[PDB]
From a paper:
Using icosahedral reconstruction method, a 4.2 Å resolution map of the extended Mu head was generated. The MCP gp34 adopts a canonical HK97-like fold. According to the domain nomenclature of MCP gp5 of HK97, each gp34 can be divided into four domains: N-arm, E-loop, P-domain, and A-domain. An asymmetric unit of the icosahedral head comprises seven gp34 monomers (one hexon and one-fifth of a penton). The superimposition of the seven gp34 monomers in an asymmetric unit revealed considerable conformational changes in the N-arms and E-loops, which ultimately led to the formation of capsomers, hexons, and pentons that are assembled into the icosahedral capsid. Analogous interactions that reinforce the inter-capsomere stability within the head, independent of cement proteins, have been identified in A-1(L), T7 (47), and R4C.
Myophage Mu is a representative of contractile nanomachines with a simple tail baseplate. It has the capacity to infect a range of intestinal bacteria and has extensive applications in genetic engineering research. The structure of extended Mu can be divided into four distinct regions: the DNA-containing head, the connector complex, the tail, and the baseplate.
Numbering used by the authors:
A (entry chain B), B (entry chain C): 1 to 51
The structure:
């Protein structure tokens, strides 16, 4: 039996990438309650007329 | 009545291979809760990056 040191025995591992994405984020569900509007300048102004 | 010895009349039986199966063992159901990876050294090292 060859008495190898501790560091050499610790280097004798194989790298596996099964844990790559970590834990996935929660589902996205903001489109159900919000209205999406695109702005083109410094700010948007909205205006409506009373009855 | 013919007096046959016990050694001759002990051969007067029928061999049946009906118990050959025996008692079956429990089902394998480790594939629903575990993931199978391979290895090629003393151990396996897994690493992932944070968010």
């Amino acid at each position: 039996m060859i008495v190898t040191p501790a560091s050499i025995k610790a280097l004798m591992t194989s790298w596996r990438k099964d844990f790559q994405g970590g834990l996935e984020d929660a589902p996205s569900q903001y489109n159900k309650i919000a209205m999406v509007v695109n702005s083109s300048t410094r700010s948007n102004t909205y205006g409506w007329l009373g009855k």
